[PDB]
Amino acid sequence: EDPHLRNRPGKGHNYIDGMTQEDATCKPVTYAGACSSFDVLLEKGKFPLFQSYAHHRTLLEAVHDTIIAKADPPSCDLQSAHGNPCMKEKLVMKTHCPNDYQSAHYLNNDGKMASVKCPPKYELTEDCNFCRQMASLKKGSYPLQDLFCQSSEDDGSKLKTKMKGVCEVGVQALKKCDGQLSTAHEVVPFAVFKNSKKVYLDKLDLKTEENLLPDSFVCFEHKGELKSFDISQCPKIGGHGSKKCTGDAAFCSAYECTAQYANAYCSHANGSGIVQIQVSGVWKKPLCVGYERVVVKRELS
Amino acid sequence: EDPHLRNRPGKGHNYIDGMTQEDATCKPVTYAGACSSFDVLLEKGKFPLFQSYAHHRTLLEAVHDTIIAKADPPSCDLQSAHGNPCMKEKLVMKTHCPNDYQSAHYLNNDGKMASVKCPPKYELTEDCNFCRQMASLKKGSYPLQDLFCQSSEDDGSKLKTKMKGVCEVGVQALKKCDGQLSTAHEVVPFAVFKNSKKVYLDKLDLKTEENLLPDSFVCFEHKGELKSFDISQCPKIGGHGSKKCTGDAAFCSAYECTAQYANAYCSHANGSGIVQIQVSGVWKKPLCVGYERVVVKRELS
Amino acid sequence: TSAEFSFVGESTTMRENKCFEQCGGWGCGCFNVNPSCLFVHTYLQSVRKEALRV
Amino acid sequence: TLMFDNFEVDFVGAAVSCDAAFLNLTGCYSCNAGARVCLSITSTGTGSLSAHNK
Q1: In sequence order, what are the residues at sequence separation of 6 or more whose Cβ sits closer than 8 angstroms to the Cβ of residue A129?
Q2: CA separation for the pair B107, B17 (Å, rounded)
Q3: Contact yes or no for A253/A236 (Cβ under 8 A)
């Protein structure tokens, strides 16, 4: 759904090494293609946060943009033999997988990129813990978390998870707890700064701020329904491009408005720009903020 | 009462440089006149002001009656993006463009008459800014604004748009607005006098003065589809000569009715005469008050 | 429930939705000069670990 | 109560010389209406006359 939100900021790479069977429809992101690792991100009633923040980076896109590094191993195999470090966090993460997909990507405790990999041709179960024997087969990765990536260089390695009356959430170990504690799956937000662990959150306070970046706008033409147009070919203030392009004040503040000498009419893109997080009152710039349902152990009596 | 709104008093010509296909079925405009530039004027749910002022002239009829001058060039092109004197005023507007149309005429700022033209067989777009590729194409144009025409020769060129509280409304830029403001896409009433500019107004105070004028009495050819006939050839009061003509009650009370000697039956116009307006607190006789959806910039700081 | 914070209303807790009106323009982080709005999803949470029965 | 709803005014002229005269002095003293004065101003340009006592 929503064909107007198919333009991805930056490079727009929704693939990874190993499962490059749909790279022709995801590099670049076309309109007639069937990107399996992006169609479920626009479905209504599942990930509302990604719908509110459409024009933003993801996990694999952040990896291909030199933002989030790869783990070791970056794609752990599902054929485990009483080991595999990428299973202790997957088993405690209660997710829903509608089969079809064979791989799934999520965020690890260190803050890199830890994903699973299934040998062809297997399909995930209702959770995604193992690929059983094999409609058709979606050669992609099912997003298990509703996080979004962004370009920022804000330092924040001296901050950890600080909650109130919480024992051990997820796979981390905050404070000591030896009395009565519960064991259930709850939705707890998280945020990772520049070179830091998977720091959880308690009271998320976002702040949408628009910018004049070229990826924060669209390019819709009229000459030739409406057809998309490449926004990177617009004129730059101070130089000269291939083609032209006009618009309003927001689009004209970054590109040269030629009015009658243009070939399209770009507008503003809804749901773009960098966001800020409120950490102890001081507004900070995170890198990946999302939601996940893992094991939460609260303090009781 | 008396559905005689199809007859066009006076000349009644709907022709323009470019639409040479409807030339044979455009001058004059009778009851059996076929043309897309006039059929859409009498349609329901589109042009309410023209339905309220049915016994009045249009734009092309005012041009052929030596009332509204023509621009240079009067018909522009929207194919090549090399630049033309028409996009500067078209980009600030926002009018709907129906399907299967190539031309779109409107009222310019200089008080003349400017229009565009699509090269065959390329039609227009949904907004009317550019032109795209191609049911059956029409042989006329489409009025972008909701204006009318009348017989008036009142002078009023030394005027200026006196609208306080707003910044750059319409096309006339009174003063800049770089601080706090709020723009939208509303409608603003305006009136163009003889050899003047598009002077916008705040409120509309129209008043139709009914009087025994030849332009307020329709007439058709009488015989044993009806055809229009010149009403100015009828005699005056207390006379029975020249071209005979009869009518009902208003035409018989104003002029004469020769019954069998008459060759054309006349009638009364359902609301017609001299239309006034309250501009600058002074009663003036305009040419054609219309509406348009342009950029309206208000003042807040 | 707002479409942005629809996942918060899934829990069976006390919550409400109160809209607000704010200014626009580039003075507070907006692309359009029209006055913007505000979407607030306020939900209640317990404080004291003990309750009273009156 | 006088209210100005964003009105634009200009003054092209300036301040030039001019002769004044006396007409009539009516009214009252030590009251709300005061005393009305009549002055005959004869100038050649558009401006304003300023007068004061001692």
Answers
A1: A78, A87, A90, A91
A2: 16
A3: no
Q: For residue A194, what are the β-bridge partners?
A: A155
**In sequence order, what DSSP letters do the residues of A231-295 get, joined into one string?**
GGGS-BTTS--SS--B-SHHHHTTB---GGG-SBB--BPSS-S-B-EEETTEEE--SEEEEEEEE
User: Closest by alpha carbon to A286, among A156, A102, A128, A138?
Assistant: A156
For residue A123, what is the enclosing H or E element? strand A122-124
A window 229-268, beta carbon within 8 A of C: 250, 268
**Cα dihedral B115/B117/B123/B129 (nearest 10):** -50
Out of B82, B83, B125, name the one closest to residue A222 (CB). B125
The first and second tokens of residue A123, run together, are 């399909």
Resolution (Å) of this entry: 8.0
DSSP string, A177-211: --S-B--EEEEEEEEE-BT---EE-SS----B---
A62 φ, ψ (degrees, to nearest 5): -70, -30
> Is B295 in the C-facing interface, judged by CB distances under 8 Å?
no
* Chain B CB contacts of D9 below 8 Å: none
Amino acid at B165: G
DSSP-derived letter for residue B254 is: H
Cα B281 to Cα A105: distance, rounded to the nearest angstrom: 72
Q: Name A117's bridge partners.
A: A77
3-state secondary structure chain D: CCCCCCCCCCCCCCCCCEEEEEEEECCCCCCCCCCCEEEEEEECCCCCCCCCCC
Does the beta-carbon distance from A210 to C31 stay under 8 Å?
yes
Q: Does A220 touch chain B (CB under 8 A)?
A: no
DSSP-derived 3-state class of residue B219: strand
Element (H, E) at A62: helix A60-63
| Token pair recorded at residue A292 | 């996940």
Residue ranges in chain B assigned as alpha helix (H): 36-39, 48-52, 60-64, 87-90, 250-254
| Residues 6+ away with beta carbon under 8 Å from A32 | none
What b/e readout covers A238-258, taking b as 16+ CB neighbours within 10 angstroms?
eeeeebbbbbbebbbebbbbb
CA A92 to CA B12: how far, in whole Å? 82
